Amino acid sequence: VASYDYLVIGGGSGGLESAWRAAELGARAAVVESHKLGGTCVNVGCVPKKVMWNTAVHSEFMHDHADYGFPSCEGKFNWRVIKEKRDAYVSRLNAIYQNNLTKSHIEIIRGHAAFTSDPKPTIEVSGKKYTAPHILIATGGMPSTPHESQIPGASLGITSDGFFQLEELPGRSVIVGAGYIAVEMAGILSALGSKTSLMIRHDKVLRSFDSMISTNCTEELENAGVEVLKFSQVKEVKKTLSGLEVSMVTAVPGRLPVMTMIPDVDCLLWAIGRVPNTKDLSLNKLGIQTDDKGHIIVDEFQNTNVKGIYAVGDVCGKALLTPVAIAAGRKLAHRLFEYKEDSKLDYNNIPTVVFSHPPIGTVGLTEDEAIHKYGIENVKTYSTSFTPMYHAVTKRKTKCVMKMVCANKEEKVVGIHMQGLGCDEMLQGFAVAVKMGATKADFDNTVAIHPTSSEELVTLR
Amino acid sequence: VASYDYLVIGGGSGGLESAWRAAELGARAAVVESHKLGGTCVNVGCVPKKVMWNTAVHSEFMHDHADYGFPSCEGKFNWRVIKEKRDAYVSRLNAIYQNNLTKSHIEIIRGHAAFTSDPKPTIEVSGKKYTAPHILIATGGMPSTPHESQIPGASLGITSDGFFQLEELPGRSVIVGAGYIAVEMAGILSALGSKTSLMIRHDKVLRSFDSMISTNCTEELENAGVEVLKFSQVKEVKKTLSGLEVSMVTAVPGRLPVMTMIPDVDCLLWAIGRVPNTKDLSLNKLGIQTDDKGHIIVDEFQNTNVKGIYAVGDVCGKALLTPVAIAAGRKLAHRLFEYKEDSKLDYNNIPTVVFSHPPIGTVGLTEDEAIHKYGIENVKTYSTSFTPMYHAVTKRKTKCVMKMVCANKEEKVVGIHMQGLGCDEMLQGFAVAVKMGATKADFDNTVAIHPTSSEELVTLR
Numbered sequence: 068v069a070s071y072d073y074l075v076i077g078g079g080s081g082g083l084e085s086a087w088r089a090a091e092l093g094a095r096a097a098v099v100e101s102h103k104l105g106g107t108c109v110n111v112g113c114v115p116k117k118v119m120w121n122t123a124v125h126s127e128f129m130h131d132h133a134d135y136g137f138p139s140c141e142g143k144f145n146w147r148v149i150k151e152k153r154d155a156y157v158s159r160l161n162a163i164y165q166n167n168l169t170k171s172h173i174e175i176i177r178g179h180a181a182f183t184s185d186p187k188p189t190i191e192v193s194g195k196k197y198t199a200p201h202i203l204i205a206t207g208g209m210p211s212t213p214h215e216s217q218i219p220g221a222s223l224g225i226t227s228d229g230f231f232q233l234e235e236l237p238g239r240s241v242i243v244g245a246g247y248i249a250v251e252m253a254g255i256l257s258a259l260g261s262k263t264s265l266m267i268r269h270d271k272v273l274r275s276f277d278s279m280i281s282t283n284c285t286e287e288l289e290n291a292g293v294e295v296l297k298f299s300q301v302k303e304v305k306k307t308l309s310g311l312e313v314s315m316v317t318a319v320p321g322r323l324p325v326m327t328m329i330p331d332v333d334c335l336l337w338a339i340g341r342v343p344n345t346k347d348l349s350l351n352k353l354g355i356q357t358d359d360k361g362h363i364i365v366d367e368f369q370n371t372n373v374k375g376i377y378a379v380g381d382v383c384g385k386a387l388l389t390p391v392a393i394a395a396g397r398k399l400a401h402r403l404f405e406y407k408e409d410s411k412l413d414y415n416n417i418p419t420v421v422f423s424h425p426p427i428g429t430v431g432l433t434e435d436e437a438i439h440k441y442g443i444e445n446v447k448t449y450s451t452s453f454t455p456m457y458h459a460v461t462k463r464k465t466k467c468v469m470k471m472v473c474a475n476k477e478e479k480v481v482g483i484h485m486q487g488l489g490c491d492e493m494l495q496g497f498a499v500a501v502k503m504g505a506t507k508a509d510f511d512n513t514v515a516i517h518p519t520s521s522e523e524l525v526t527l528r
Numbered sequence: 529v530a531s532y533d534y535l536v537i538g539g540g541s542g543g544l545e546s547a548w549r550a551a552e553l554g555a556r557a558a559v560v561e562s563h564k565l566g567g568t569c570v571n572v573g574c575v576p577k578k579v580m581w582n583t584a585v586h587s588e589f590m591h592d593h594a595d596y597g598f599p600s601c602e603g604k605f606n607w608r609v610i611k612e613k614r615d616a617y618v619s620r621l622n623a624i625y626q627n628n629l630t631k632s633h634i635e636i637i638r639g640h641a642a643f644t645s646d647p648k649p650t651i652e653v654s655g656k657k658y659t660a661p662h663i664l665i666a667t668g669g670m671p672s673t674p675h676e677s678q679i680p681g682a683s684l685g686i687t688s689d690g691f692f693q694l695e696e697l698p699g700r701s702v703i704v705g706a707g708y709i710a711v712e713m714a715g716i717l718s719a720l721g722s723k724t725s726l727m728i729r730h731d732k733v734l735r736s737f738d739s740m741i742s743t744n745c746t747e748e749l750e751n752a753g754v755e756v757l758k759f760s761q762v763k764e765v766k767k768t769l770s771g772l773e774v775s776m777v778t779a780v781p782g783r784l785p786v787m788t789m790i791p792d793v794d795c796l797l798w799a800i801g802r803v804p805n806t807k808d809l810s811l812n813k814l815g816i817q818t819d820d821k822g823h824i825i826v827d828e829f830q831n832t833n834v835k836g837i838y839a840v841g842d843v844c845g846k847a848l849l850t851p852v853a854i855a856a857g858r859k860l861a862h863r864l865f866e867y868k869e870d871s872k873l874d875y876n877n878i879p880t881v882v883f884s885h886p887p888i889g890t891v892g893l894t895e896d897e898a899i900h901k902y903g904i905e906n907v908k909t910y911s912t913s914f915t916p917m918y919h920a921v922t923k924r925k926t927k928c929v930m931k932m933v934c935a936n937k938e939e940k941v942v943g944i945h946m947q948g949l950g951c952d953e954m955l956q957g958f959a960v961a962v963k964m965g966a967t968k969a970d971f972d973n974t975v976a977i978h979p980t981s982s983e984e985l986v987t988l989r
């Protein structure tokens with residue numbers, strides 16, 4: 068047993084940041100990583116996702132060329148080119164992340180960690196044992212897929228991970244899911260040329276977002292040429308001569324169900340969920356708690372039920388975003404190594420952006436979450452809808468919707484939701500303001516920047 | 529003399545908003561406009577400027593096409609097309625602005641107003657007389673041009689107004705000026721294909737901005753192919769067989785001066801200044817104060833030295849931006865018609881964006897204005913510089929610089945300056961935060977949005 072001051076399991080967003088902050092404070096740390104550092108985000112997430120998005124944004128502006136006075140292009144995108152490059156960038160970052168750990172004196176135990184029987188919290192990487200007064204489990208999660216039992220042929224399709232392995236553009240794409248990943252994959256594949264279909268169990272996507280967003284987002288998808296199959300779901304999948312044959316059942320309320328075969332499908336992508344990566348950790352040896360789905364149960368301070376063990380990031384289940392994982396590891400490191408008993412992450416007013424077309428920006432309470440916590444009498448919402456002046460000279464259009472949810476008489480801005488061009492870089496600023504507890508008066512007392520879309524939030528009447 | 533409750537002179541940004549807010553409060557208002565409503569901003573400013581910018585942004589992304597897997601285009605932009613459209617949009621807006629005044633019951637005295645001899649403040653539009661207990665002068669300004677006396681041939685060139693009259697792209701462009709307009713014109717003409725030169729009296733542009741900006745902005749201009757002629761200035765201009773011949777004098781400190789002839793110049797654009805539009809108003813009949821340059825002198829409440837007369841917008845000289853003009857007319861209307869003695873506009877922390885390539889965003893104190901008002905011991909600046917991941921796969925690059933100026937021990941964020949992709953839509957949010965009096969801790973306690981450029985401001989260390 069080599070002893071350390073900190074032993075982080077998983078070198079993803081959460082593990083790395085916590086280790087970095089701990090080392091900065093004096094601790095002798097080591098990180099246990101079974102694969103590539105940078106985790107899900109760098110290797111199969113944020114990074115490669117956003118590169119492919121910047122590419123989709125390009126095809127969509129090839130369509131506005133002639134309107135702007137330029138001669139139009141003949142087409143034919145090449146997936147290989149942009150893939151080789153996307154992959155290279157991910158290599159450049161790995162190298163970078165290795166270097167940082169090294170120059171920071173953070174040891175890297177490479178391999179798969181699992182807990183042991185030793186009473187004192189101890190893990191064992193490759194027959195060898197390591198222990199520490201503080202162990203952070205930050206192993207994340209993975210895309211869930213349906214068992215061949217209920218969906219015979221389910222394994223025939225791919226996941227987001229497999230999307231980043233695609234080497235040529237799928238001719239016919241069918242995506243099953245209604246969350247941000249699902250939406251993003253559908254938006255990228257469709258803009259780049261694939262005949263795409265998004266299969267959802269209901270009528271709208273991102274149903275957990277403010278109604279104005281799920282409504283607008285389902286619409287803009289339809290308007291962009293993505294076939295949305297509502298109240299539909301996969302019954303089975305089969306490999307035919309030319310691609311897969313997907314049989315789905317559509318049960319639109321008020322009507323009788325209908326079976327449908329989607330043939331010649333090159334790509335069936337499961338974007339149905341993320342499952343925690345916790346079995347093989349041998350949590351059962353310490354009685355470490357988990358919920359019915361395997362997520363590790365922690366408290367406000369990221370504490371498991373076992374002393375000297377913590378969990379952060381996706382593995383916990385709450386707020387599946389890289390900067391939440393980071394913020395939690397950073398705050399933990401400070402509580403442990405800088406002794407600030409009160410360093411926890413406030414999970415309220417976390418900003419999120421969904422890179423669809425147009426981009427979605429959202430922070431805070433939805434109108435309903437607001438109505439519920441305050442009451443209809445005390446919730447006033449303000450909102451606008453317009454066509455960005457960028458579309459003033461284009462046949463093509465996309466709208467821009469902005470809702471502002473205010474609570475009580477002072478009108479504390481408790482939620483801002485929007486969808487439109489520029490909404491991705493537009494949010495961080497207001498997120499700070501919302502986090503400071505701004506009121507509608509503060510926004511209104513801020514001089515506008517003309518001409519911009521952002522200026523519509525400081526002139527909402 | 530027809531009497532009203534409010535008589536606004538000029539239907540631009542400031543006059544229109546003040547009239548609208550006044551009418552909403554009960555006042556019987558009328559607006560006096562000698563030309564097209566919407567003013568400088570709609571007719572020869574913000575609106576047409578930003579359309580031409582969106583177009584320049586397009587040529588600059590035609591250059592990243594092949595990098596993103598798409599086949600490249602043969603070129604040849606067409607100025608006519610985008611002009612007909614830009615002009616049409618401006619017509620659509622005028623019509624809109626007319627309609628609003630009408631549906632709001634604001635009368636429109638069309639023609640040129642001038643003050644009279646009548647003791648009681650009275651103006652006369654076309655032989656007819658109008659008076660009111662409250663007159664707002666919101667006549668704005670105009671591009672200044674050099675007198676043929678000192679610069680023989682100065683009149684041969686055009687101004688920003690004349691830029692919006694151009695019907696074909698200038699082959700060779702030379703722009704004289706170092707402010708935002710100058711920079712923007714140079715950036716648009718150059719991106720769209722003109723062989724451009726920007727003539728400045730010093731070494732850098734936007735010299736009144738934070739040093740990191742004038743430095744970065746002079747650099748990115750050079751890197752984009754805009755020839756910047758430093759310590760240079762026009763001596764005279766002449767019309768030759770093929771375009772104008774510009775003779776300038778370059779006096780770089782440490783060296784002897786050199787005369788230079790720039791020949792074959794199709795366009796010489798004066799972007800040297802804006803002069804107030806106040807002579808023909810006959811200010812002298814009421815003894816209304818003005819500075820040595822004709823700007824009308826007002827106080828914190830927009831009061832002239834004469835009772836019942838006010839001034840807002842460019843005409844005053846302070847903060848030459850549409851939303852400052854608007855904010856001042858709106859606040860005035862409330863002071864006058866809603867009787868709130870304390871409604872004045874706070875001229876501190878006004879956000880501004882300069883649509884160069886890449887866009888500049890800035891709000892607050894520059895490092896020096898901070899150092900001066902607080903002292904070197906009390907000013908801490910934070911800053912970063914990086915290449916946006918959009919350029920991770922492009923031969924072409926543009927940087928992104930961000931400086932954060934903090935004052936005192938709490939580190940109140942008193943100034944944020946940046947230049948880069950997305951910085952135009954990125955600013956409004958932080959401007960609200962800065963206006964609320966945020967500290968570096970507030971920014972740091974805001975969860976980041978990954979991956980974005982905006983996220984670099986909440987992780988500045």
Ligand SMILES: NCCCCNCCCNC(=O)CNC(=O)[C@H](CSSC[C@H](NC(=O)CC[C@@H](N)C(=O)O)C(=O)NCC(=O)NCCCNCCCCN)NC(=O)CC[C@@H](N)C(=O)O
Pocket residue numbers: 079080083084105106107108109113114160163164389390393912913914915916917918978979980981982983984985987988989
């Ligand atoms: N504002 C100053 C602080 C930010 C410094 N970035 C350097 C300037 C960019 N230079 C450049 O030349 C361009 N930058 C990039 O190449 C990298 C790629 S991923 S690196 C971005 C990084 N990651 C996270 O946000 C997510 C956690 C991550 N481990 C994961 O799982 O993905 C972040 O900033 N971490 C805070 C922290 O943990 N670490 C901080 C350092 C980031 N790690 C690597 C930086 C260099 C890139 N490998 N940065 C990003 O894409 C995000 C930042 C964005 N501004 C951008 O640059 O596009």
Ligand SMILES: NCCCCNCCCNC(=O)CNC(=O)[C@H](CSSC[C@H](NC(=O)CC[C@@H](N)C(=O)O)C(=O)NCC(=O)NCCCNCCCCN)NC(=O)CC[C@@H](N)C(=O)O
Pocket residue numbers: 451452453454455456457517518519520521522523524526527528540541544545566567568569570574575621624625850851854
């Ligand atoms: N968030 C709700 C409040 C904003 C409402 N805009 C309508 C939604 C956009 N719909 C759409 O379909 C697209 N909008 C546009 O066509 C117009 C063109 S100029 S109109 C923008 C306007 N002007 C000023 O900022 C500058 C003063 C001006 N008189 C000048 O001199 O230029 C502003 O919002 N004024 C506050 C106020 O005085 N008046 C408010 C109404 C604006 N006047 C005209 C609106 C319709 C366009 N004619 N708006 C803009 O370009 C700026 C807003 C920006 N979000 C955008 O839409 O691009």
Ligand SMILES: Cc1cc2nc3c(=O)[nH]c(=O)nc-3n(C[C@H](O)[C@H](O)[C@H](O)COP(=O)(O)OP(=O)(O)OC[C@H]3O[C@@H](n4cnc5c(N)ncnc54)[C@H](O)[C@@H]3O)c2cc1C
Pocket residue numbers: 076077078079080081082099100101102103104105106107108111112113116178179180181205206207208227248344347348379380381382387388389390392978979
């Ligand atoms: C497609 C797709 C797109 C996404 N886009 C975004 C986005 O734009 N923005 C965003 O904020 N988030 C995005 N996410 C979410 C983000 O990837 C995750 O929330 C973030 O990765 C969480 O970090 P973590 O520290 O819990 O995990 P991870 O990054 O998953 O890191 C865990 C690491 O632990 C290693 N590991 C696991 N078990 C062990 C073990 N026993 N021993 C050793 N090593 C082990 C893993 O190999 C991995 O490298 C996306 C996710 C997917 C999938």
Ligand SMILES: Cc1cc2nc3c(=O)[nH]c(=O)nc-3n(C[C@H](O)[C@H](O)[C@H](O)COP(=O)(O)OP(=O)(O)OC[C@H]3O[C@@H](n4cnc5c(N)ncnc54)[C@H](O)[C@@H]3O)c2cc1C
Pocket residue numbers: 517518537538539540541542543560561562563564565566567568569572573574577639640641642666667668669688709805808809840841842843848849850851853
């Ligand atoms: C090129 C260029 C680009 C610009 N870009 C931007 C930008 O992106 N953002 C921004 O914020 N600002 C920009 N500006 C600045 C913005 O145009 C002005 O600050 C804004 O127009 C100020 O409004 P105002 O009410 O004082 O004036 P104005 O809009 O100028 O309105 C005054 C009106 O008064 C009328 N008038 C004048 N005298 C009389 C009289 N005696 N009788 C009757 N009518 C009269 C005029 O014809 C005019 O229509 C730009 C300016 C130029 C020039």
